[PDB]
């Protein structure tokens, strides 16, 4: 055995951990962008409905 | 292999910190985005109000 | 059930991804435990753990591996023919069991 082999071995696992975590973080960014656009399509739609009512 | 042990325990913290702070800053991102775009849309609607009032 | 016997620092504190595991028994199989306790499974991290207790027949090693990789640890332990010994990290209930045993001892008197 060798502690270098230990480092590579554990880095397989750290690769999995960090990469899944950061892929989900990128999904959180996808939320911040497109789910933000969806909350726009909802709330601004209600605002626009208000303005038709008023007109 | 102790170097690896400690630095990769540190790597567990990279994943957790980045995910957790991304999640907690998603609230900030969404709230800022609301604060911007929807009020801007409000202002466009009031401009359009002035237009139709001119026609009226 | 180890609880009180557990050397508490031998585990990964806040084992969010990396947790310690224990399927290790017969002495007659321990001919290569120096290899196994560091690499029984491929991605083991043994620097921050030790054997919880010693019998003349077995060594109860607290080997480190990942949330999913507990399955791999069990697989290679069973390749070595080891048998259930784990603790699950049950430490607040270790405290509860200490209180219960003390309660029973006092109740005797």
Given helix and strand content, the structural type of chain B is mainly alpha
Overall radius of gyration of chain B: 24 Å
Name the helix and strand elements of chain A from N-terminus to C-terminus, one letter apiece.
H
The major pleated sheet of chain B works out as: none
N-to-C span of chain A: 79 Å
The end-to-end span of chain B amounts to: 81 Å
**Mind telling me the C-alpha Rg of chain A?**
23 Å
Task: Report the order of strands and helices of chain B.
Answer: H
The assigned structural class of chain A equals mainly alpha
Largest sheet of chain A: none
User: What would the principal axes of the Cα set say about the shape of chain B?
Assistant: rod-shaped
Count the E strands of chain B.
0
Strand content of chain A: under 5%
SS strand fraction of chain B: under 5%
Quaternary assembly: part of a larger assembly
Number of H- or I-type helical stretches of chain B = 1
Helix content of chain B: over 70%
Number of helices of chain A: 1
Report helical residue fraction of chain A: over 70%
PDB class: proton transport
Keywords: Synaptic, proton transport
Entry title: Synaptic Vesicle V-ATPase with synaptophysin and SidK, State 2
Chain A: V-type proton ATPase subunit E 1
Protein model, in words:
The structure is cut from a larger assembly and holds chains A (55 residues), B (56 residues) and C (109 residues). Chain A has 55 residues and is mainly α. Helix content of chain A is 95%, strand content 0%. Chain A is rod-shaped and about 80 Å long. The relative contact order of chain A is 0.06. Chain C has a single domain, classed as Alpha-Beta Plaits, CATH 3.30.70.100. Chain C has helices at 33-39, 70-79, 92-108, and strands at 18-21, 51-54, 59-61, 63-66. Chain C has a two-stranded antiparallel sheet with strand order 1-4. Chain C has a two-stranded antiparallel ribbon with strand order 2-3. In chain C, strand 2 (51-54) and strand 3 form a beta hairpin. Chains in contact: A-B, A-C, B-C. Chain A binds chain B through residues 1-7, 9-11, 13-14, 17-18, 20-22, 24-25, 28-29, 31-32, 35-36, 39-40, 43-44, 47-48, 51, 54-55, and chain B through 1-5, 7-8, 11-12, 14-16, 18-19, 22-23, 26, 29-30, 33-34, 37-38, 41-42, 45, 48-49, 52. It is classed as proton transport. Keywords: Synaptic, membrane, proton transport. Synaptic Vesicle V-ATPase with synaptophysin and SidK, State 2. Chain A: V-type proton ATPase subunit E 1. Organism of A: Rattus norvegicus.
